[PDB]
């Protein structure tokens with residue numbers, strides 16, 4: 001497969017800035033969801049799940065085709081809980097019917113990180129909706145009950161190296177795990193709807209204890225009332241992942257710069273950009289616009 005990016009006909013930077021402003025205004029408005037965490041965390045989880053199905057070997061999956069709109073992908077057990085981010089963006093897609101699904105789903109993640117005081121993520125337009133028979137089969141997304149070798153091996157399918165994996169996982173400071181969606185329960189830190197380097201500081205400074213939860217799954221719990229998944233805790237058990245974790249705990253600006261590059265790469269995997277294509281867009285936040 002080749003998936004060549006095609007710009008939505010006649011659209012420019014200012015058109016996309018209006019879809020970004022509509023998502024960001026609705027993030028401001030619907031601030032009560034999930035005990036006042038708001039929709040920012042579930043929207044970056046949605047952008048990572050529609051992108052994490054990619055396979056480098058045959059170019060199938062990935063954000064291009066916007067195939068999470070189909071029932072097979074939508075009802076994947078690993079996507080339980082994302083129906084909420086879908087329902088959030090759905091009025092916005094009726095307001096801007098020209099935007100493709102892969103572009104809206106991925107831009108939702110970019111808008112959420114920037115509006116939660118995260119780094120600026122450059123974003124490129126041009127994903128094209130593809131037919132229901134291009135929808136990936138279930139089972140390409142990662143398990144949480146595993147170790148650092150599984151994590152390393154998993155992310156090699158999306159050719160992410162060690163530093164990209166540790167930067168990307170820092171998004172687990174956002175939102176929380178929910179027992180009815182995944183069989184895990186609890187948040188990763190205190191500031192879970194502001195983007196910071198908190199995940200790394202917690203993983204290095206909390207007294208973590210291994211316990212089984214009410215779904216019979218193991219997780220690491222701390223005195224503070226925080227939790228870590230087996231795959232998260234992995235990052236301090238592997239010597240190569242641990243030096244990068246220490247680096248981001250001591251330097252939030254390095255973390256923001258690396259998360260920015262790795263997240264854009266994740267959202268563009270599997271897509272060919274022609275060089276007549278527009279350069280990546282950097283969107284202004286509401287605050288920068290006075291809105």
Ligand code: HEM
Pocket residue numbers: 041042044045048080081142143144151168169171172174175176177178179181182183184229231
């Ligand atoms: C080995 C990789 C990963 C595993 C096993 C994993 C697993 C999980 C699980 C089990 C949840 C909880 C879902 C729920 O109960 O609602 C979760 C939440 C979340 N994940 Fe991941 N994750 C991984 C990687 C990532 C990456 C790379 C990102 C983003 C760049 C990410 C972003 C999020 C976010 C923001 C949440 C919170 C969602 C919410 O509050 O509803 N995850 N993760």
